Design a binder for these strands. Structure first.
Lengths: 236, 236
DNA sequence: TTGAGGCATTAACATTTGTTAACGACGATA
DNA sequence: TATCGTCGTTAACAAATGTTAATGCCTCAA
């Protein structure tokens, strides 16, 4: 992205060099809260939370370049206890101390607006996602989450639209929609397989009826159209 | 509170004076989408969306002072098609044109951080709310929404904690949690009535077991502690 | 006093989802 | 080769939620 490359060179002009992480590694976590401004430049990650009773929740995925704040900018305190796990093989991110960030954005306003814009993309995204997961229950939550992955990690193929995401087990989908048991997620997939909506070929998901998912996630599709028009046009 | 007064006097220097609205009135809407930056100064509102088949969704409430973005700052387009209905008798809000906002925040950087902070409070709120409504289904969604209302509109009294909302029908709670039929909301409330969690006096809600709701909304309670510590202290 | 309409409660059914378990396929280690 | 572990189906059962309808309470309007 053009605005992220200029934000890279800027952070590298002020001595904020990149750090490397590998799969399964946590940039920040929920137990040792440290207020950071993560600038995920390259890689794929998921924001998770583990309750006291052990249940895992997959709140959302993040694909670079994007910005994830674990602390506020004025109070410099925590926004919440979450984990940011790397799920791609390797991921590069610039870890910025919350205090210095405040100083970098006051210098240059083009990068202030950039971090502000990406923050607006976060707000609209959560509202849309919250809207679609609530109306139609779990079937809609699985359909809605699949629609997200299809736009971001989808590539057209002979057999539909291939989701280029490894280790997307049944447990990982259930975590995204609040389903605790893999058998429940599976039962829903067997209904979508029978309805010719998707095919689970080779431990990879193929989408053949994009319109059906658009039915159950109208606001999320509306969001990709409005907020990520390039990613949306590639499938329309 | 205090930082909003400085944002008031500031807005009262660049000729962007406040407009007054009454109950049932829509500041912005989904069908005629104008891009504005709302600075709700005083009053109560709800952000809604109406599907194509008429179903209503209540995404969240807003009590001044707060900021609601209906459009992006860089692209100057809409963040999504939503309605912002006034539910209090009278509400005062400063309507800012989206094209003017970018120049106004560059003048004073302390008010830039203010609008930036309130957006981080929006992001954290949506993640927490999304987290708690997903784990335990609809019972948890009603409990979580109730926990929200209890902190923002709750006042301790001899019997229970009064949720001071004039119109809080069964149908309006279902809209907040994705329940389409009021009879389903009632059945859930009848379970909470029998379990000594809440009572129903004068079409008004009273909470007697706040801890029971915290079980079903751990992230939302965590959020009030971190983001609205004053509102949290009033009940702890 | 009469009658209409909104709202809450309850019921009874249909559908979905939570929960536990058995079967069978695949990969890995020795 | 044999055998353990993980993950995906499918089943059966329990529990929650969707859906519709009848009922009773209340305010309003004439």
């Amino acid at each position: 992205n053009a605005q992220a490359e200029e934000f890279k060179k800027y952070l590298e002009t002020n001595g904020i060099k990149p750090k490397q992480f590998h799969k399964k590694e946590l940039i920040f976590n929920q137990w040792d809260p440290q207020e950071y401004c993560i600038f995920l430049y390259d890689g794929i990650t998921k924001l998770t939370s583990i309750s006291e009773n052990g249940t895992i929740m997959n709140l959302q995925y993040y694909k670079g370049a994007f910005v994830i704040m674990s602390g506020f900018i004025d109070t410099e305190t925590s926004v919440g206890y979450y984990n940011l796990e790397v799920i791609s093989e390797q991921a590069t991110a610039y870890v910025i101390k919350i205090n210095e960030l405040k100083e970098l954005l006051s210098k240059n306003l083009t990068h202030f607006f950039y971090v502000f814009q990406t923050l607006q993309k976060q707000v609209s995204y959560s509202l849309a996602k919250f809207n679609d997961f609530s109306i139609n229950g779990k079937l809609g939550s699985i359909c809605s989450q699949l629609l997200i992955l299809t736009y971001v990690y989808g590539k057209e193929t002979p057999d539909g639209i291939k989701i280029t995401l490894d280790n997307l087990t049944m447990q990982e989908l259930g975590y995204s929609s609040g389903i605790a048991h893999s058998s429940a997620v599976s039962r829903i997939i067997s209904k979508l397989k029978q309805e010719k909506v998707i095919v689970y070929k080779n431990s990879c998901f193929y989408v053949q009826n994009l319109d059906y998912l658009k039915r159950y996630a109208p606001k999320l599709d509306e969001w990709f159209y409005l907020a990520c028009p390039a990613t949306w046009g590639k499938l329309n």
